Amino acid sequence: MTNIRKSHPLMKIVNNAFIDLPAPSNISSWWNFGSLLGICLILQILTGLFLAMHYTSDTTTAFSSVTHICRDVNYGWIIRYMHANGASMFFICLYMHVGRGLYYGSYTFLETWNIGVILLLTVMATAFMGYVLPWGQMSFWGATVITNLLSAIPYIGTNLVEWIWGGFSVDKATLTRFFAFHFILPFIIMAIAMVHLLFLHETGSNNPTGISSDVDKIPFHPYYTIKDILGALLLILALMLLVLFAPDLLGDPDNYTPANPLNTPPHIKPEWYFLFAYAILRSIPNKLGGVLALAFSILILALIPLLHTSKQRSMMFRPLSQCLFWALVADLLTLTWIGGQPVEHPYITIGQLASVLYFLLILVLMPTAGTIENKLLKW
Amino acid sequence: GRQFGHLTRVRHVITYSLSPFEQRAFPHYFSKGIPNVLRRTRACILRVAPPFVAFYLVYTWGTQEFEKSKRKNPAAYENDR
């Protein structure tokens, strides 16, 4: 390393965690969602910032101010639309970034998975709170439902809720909080991210066949750096095309009306990416037991590594283990549309049915599927 | 590399010490100490004090010279003419 400029400030040797990080040869495009999360994250914080400079947190002000942006501020309309739609284009990435996780059995990495779980669990909190900030009608009641739901806890419930509200209801001081949180909190996600990426550098990436790739490696600079850029580009359209021609399409909530606590909207739902979770809840008639499922919905992702039941990592070689997996996809997709429907006996029964199936696939079938095929191949 | 192994080379240097229990938290704190403070207070004080002294004078002098000017108008020009 003679006059290699990579040593001289030390910090650049830390920057050879990228450039020479060896990688597998064969990598499907499905591994591009590594980057496209990050860039969807950065593009927030900036566009997340220049909204803050004109926003104001007050029960009296807030809604007026958001009016004030789209009308009077030069280029003020693009930003608000990049930010909001920049949320949805964030999840649609995020889920895929889990999907690759299972179907190739990347969860075998035991630590990096977990930090994965938390890192999800935080976002769902952030992308919630902000959704209150506009203080519109669907924000007000959609605030009461989610929080007041938490009263289910047997004893400390009644106090613990009133604590967060800072009062009896969702009036001012409940707003001001949810600004100061939704502001800071992404930075922490950025903090964890540079941890969540760390452990990965020890074992390198997995690769589609589920085989130790040792004999075949490639420099990271000339090759995958382009492919991410190419990946980075297709996002923009998918972001622009949506945000530019059809603003309100995925902006499915129709309600800009200033919140009136007296009135109630006939139908009330979160925005789309939440629905299925909220759909789980309606199933259980028993209130307390109902909440647990919703909490237990995601956490099961942490228990999956205990269920690795077979002798080969991938699902690309297991037809059965592949067969079921897709049914789980439609099963979720079902839940989405279910919750987006009124609670009327043709729907009611259905959600109750799809609920059990969901767990039954993950928690029983899939761990069994691997057992048979071991027996088949004579393993 | 690793910090402690390779630091430097030293030869034939012997060290002795006691448990912290065997010995005391104050081996003649006041008696042995109070002289030690003095002999090491004076070594600096020659080098330290004088500049601050200059400041305080300026400060006092400054206020007085300031005071006479403003407070007494009939000083240089008295009220006759």
């Binding site: 900036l46 220049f50 400079m53 004030h68 009077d72 501020v73 030069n74 280029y75 003020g76 693009i78 930003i79 | -």
Partner: protein, 49 residues
């Protein structure tokens, strides 16, 4: 593609279009003739004119 967007963000901080409308609004064409006239209030301050 670079220069526009950069110039677009920075165009957010610079000036509102509302405040700019409140700059130099006193047109006059009234007063009170002679040496007393009346008055106004331009950029915040207000005295005599």
């Amino acid at each position: 593609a670079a220069k526009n967007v950069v110039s677009q963000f920075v165009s957010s901080m610079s000036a509102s279009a509302d405040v700019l409308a409140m700059s130099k609004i006193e047109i006059k064409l009234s007063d009170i003739p002679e040496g007393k006239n009346m008055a106004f209030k331009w950029r915040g301050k207000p005295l005599f004119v």
